[PDB]
Amino acid sequence: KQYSQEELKEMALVEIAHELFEEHKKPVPFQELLNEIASLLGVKKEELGDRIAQFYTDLNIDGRFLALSDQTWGLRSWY
Amino acid sequence: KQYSQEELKEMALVEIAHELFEEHKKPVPFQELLNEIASLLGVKKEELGDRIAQFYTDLNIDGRFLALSDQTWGLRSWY
Ligand code: NI
Ligand code: NI
Mapping DSSP to helix (H, G, I), strand (E, B) and coil, where does residue A72 land? strand
Continuous segment of H or E residues that includes residue A66: strand A65-68
What are the beta bridge partners of residue A72?
Answer: B29, B68
Per the structure, how many domains does chain B have? Answer: 1
Three-class HEC string of A41-77: CCCCHHHHCCHHHHHHHHHHHCCCEEEECCCEEEEHH
Q: Look up residue A33 and give its amino acid.
A: L
Task: Please tell me the distance between residue B61's alpha carbon and the centre of ligand 2 in angstroms.
Answer: 5
Distance CA A73, CA B13 (A): 14
Residue A49 φ/ψ, nearest 5 degrees: 35, -105
Residue A74 φ/ψ, nearest 5 degrees: -165, -175
Distance CA B1, CA B16 (A): 11
- The CA-CA-CA angle for residues A18, A24, A27, to 5°, reads 75
**Cβ < 5 A residues, ion ligand 1:** A 65
The domain in which residue B67 lies consists of 1-79
**Is the separation of the CB atoms in B14 and B62 below 8 Å?**
yes
What's the Cα-to-Cα distance from B55 to each of A60, B10, B16, B58, B60, rounded to whole Å? 30, 14, 10, 5, 9
Which residues in chain B touch residue A74, judged by CB atoms under 8 angstroms apart?
21, 26-28, 65-66, 68
Distance CA B62, CA B14 (A): 9
User: Resolution, rounded to a tenth of an Å?
Assistant: 2.2
| Helix, strand, coil percentages, rounded to 5, for chain B | 55, 15, 30
Which of the 8 DSSP states describes residue B77?
Answer: G
- In this structure, are strands B72-75 and A65-68 parallel, antiparallel, or unpaired? antiparallel
Task: Please tell me the distance between residue A62's alpha carbon and the centre of ligand 1 in angstroms.
Answer: 5
- In this structure, are strands A65-68 and B28-29 parallel, antiparallel, or unpaired? unpaired
What is the domain-level CATH number for residue A57?
Answer: 1.10.10.1250
| Probe site for chain A from B18, B61, B70 (most A CB atoms < 10 A) | B70
